[PDB]
Amino acid sequence: ITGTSTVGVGRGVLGDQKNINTTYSTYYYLQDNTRGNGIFTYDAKYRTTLPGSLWADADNQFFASYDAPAVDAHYYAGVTYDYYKNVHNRLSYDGNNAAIRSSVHYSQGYNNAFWNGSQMVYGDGDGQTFIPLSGGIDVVAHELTHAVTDYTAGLIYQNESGAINEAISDIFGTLVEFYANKNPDWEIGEDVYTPGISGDSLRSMSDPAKYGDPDHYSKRYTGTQDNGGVHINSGIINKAAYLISQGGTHYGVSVVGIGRDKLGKIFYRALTQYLTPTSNFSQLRAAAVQSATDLYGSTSQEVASVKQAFDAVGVK
Ligand SMILES: [Ca+2]
Ligand SMILES: [Ca+2]
Ligand SMILES: [Ca+2]
Ligand SMILES: [Ca+2]
Ligand SMILES: [Zn+2]
């Protein structure tokens, strides 16, 4: 890890050419010394033991298919770091510039990715349902945002708190996708999901019910699956967030869109200054309204739009 900072070149999961920050001692390692205490990408070698080996390359050129997921994990972790620093003035996930670690090639045909409490972990997918998940930018940002949440609001992963947690992750994932301006959309996971099927995705913020998730509180999942539906009920918060930014009419309730940036500022403020581990949807509403009030003033259009948006999804 002690070495000379330099720049390598490679190809990502989708075949796009990419420059990446690397470190050289006797080998070129994926270690980025330009951001905080650094970004480290590891090879899990198809096994489940973590983190694995710090990625080492001989020529500082990663064009091998085996290389592709490491390139994107390393790179997109950088973009996400840049996002929080430049937009939100936050240094890494803990605010202290903690090192960011990612392991790729996790297990075999593993169709998920996650934050394990320490590092990010990415599967390669089975090549049918998924391709390597580090290929999506919103996925990377989604997982990385879990750390941010873990270090600030500490939303428990279960029931409504959990749903909020997931929603935050999707929201900021999407915002990062827009920030990097790489084929941005309000869909989640569209780049790495189901190769061979065009136009679909894992979740939709604009229209969750497309994939069977609730767009309204009365439609919320009350069962015990998925930790009480953290990946399901998130649709309700996701829809509200979409409406705040883009505006629209939902179940007869109209919302004036205030844009992405203000959405981001409002929700980041709610996340950092207000939400607690046990916060529910109502409390989230309160937090967001208070945040918007803090930033733009109580009589502002912004507050009004937050209100309208949460009214639309039936969260009072
Ligand atoms: Ca090489
Ligand atoms: Ca996209
Ligand atoms: Ca997306
Ligand atoms: Ca697809
Ligand atoms: Zn998540």
The annotation places the binding site at 57, 59, 61, 138, 142, 146, 166, 177, 183, 185, 187, 190, 194, 197, 200
Rounded to an integer, what distance in angstroms lies between the CA atom of residue 289 and that of residue 74? 36
Question: C-alpha angle 260/190/132, rounded to 5°?
Answer: 120
The annotation places the binding site for Ca(2+) at 57, 59, 61, 138, 177, 183, 185, 187, 190, 194, 197, 200
Reading the block at residue 23, the tokens are: 């470190």
Question: Which ligand is closest in space to the CA of residue 188?
Answer: 3
Which amino acid makes up residue 169? S
**Which string of b and e fits 154-180 if b means at least 16 CB within 10 Å?**
ebbbbbbbbbbbbbbbbbbbbbbbbbb
Closest CA to 239 of 142, 149, 311: 311
Cα(186) to ligand 2 centroid in Å equals 8
Question: Which ligand is closest in space to the CA of residue 200?
Answer: 4
Rounded to an integer, what distance in angstroms lies between the CA atom of residue 158 and that of residue 224? 9
Query: Active-site residue numbers?
Result: 143, 231
Cα(78) to ligand 5 centroid in Å equals 19
Cα(190) to ligand 4 centroid in Å equals 6
Rounded to an integer, what distance in angstroms lies between the CA atom of residue 303 and that of residue 312? 14
Which H, E and C letters describe the chain, residue by residue? Answer: CCCEEEEEEEECCCCCEEEEEEEECCCEECEECCCCCCEEEEECCCCCCCCCEECEECCCEECCHHHHHHHHHHHHHHHHHHHHHHCCCCCCCCCCCCCEEEEEEECCCCCCEEECCCCEEEECCCCCCECCHHHCHHHHHHHHHHHHHHHCCCCCCCHHHHHHHHHHHHHHHHHHHHHHCCCCCCEECCCCECCCCCCCCCEECCCHHHCCCCCCHHHCCCCCCHHHHCCCCHHHHHHHHHHHHHCEEECCEEECCCCHHHHHHHHHHHHHHCCCCCCCHHHHHHHHHHHHHHHHCCCCHHHHHHHHHHHHCCCC
Rounded to an integer, what distance in angstroms lies between the CA atom of residue 24 and that of residue 22? 7
**Which string of b and e fits 188-200 if b means at least 16 CB within 10 Å?**
bbbbbbbeeeeee
Residues with CB under 5 A from ligand 5 (ion): 166, 169
Dihedral angle, C-alpha 115, 116, 121, 123, nearest 10 °:
-100
User: Domains in the chain, please, with CATH?
Assistant: 6-154 (3.10.170.10), 155-315 (1.10.390.10)
β partners of residue 129 = none
In total, the chain counts a number of residues equal to 316
Question: Which ligand is closest in space to the CA of residue 113?
Answer: 5
Query: How many CB atoms sit inside 10 A of residue 223's CB?
Result: 8
The annotation places the binding site for Zn(2+) at 142, 146, 166
Residues with CB under 5 A from ligand 3 (ion): 138, 177, 185, 187
Which amino acid makes up residue 162? G
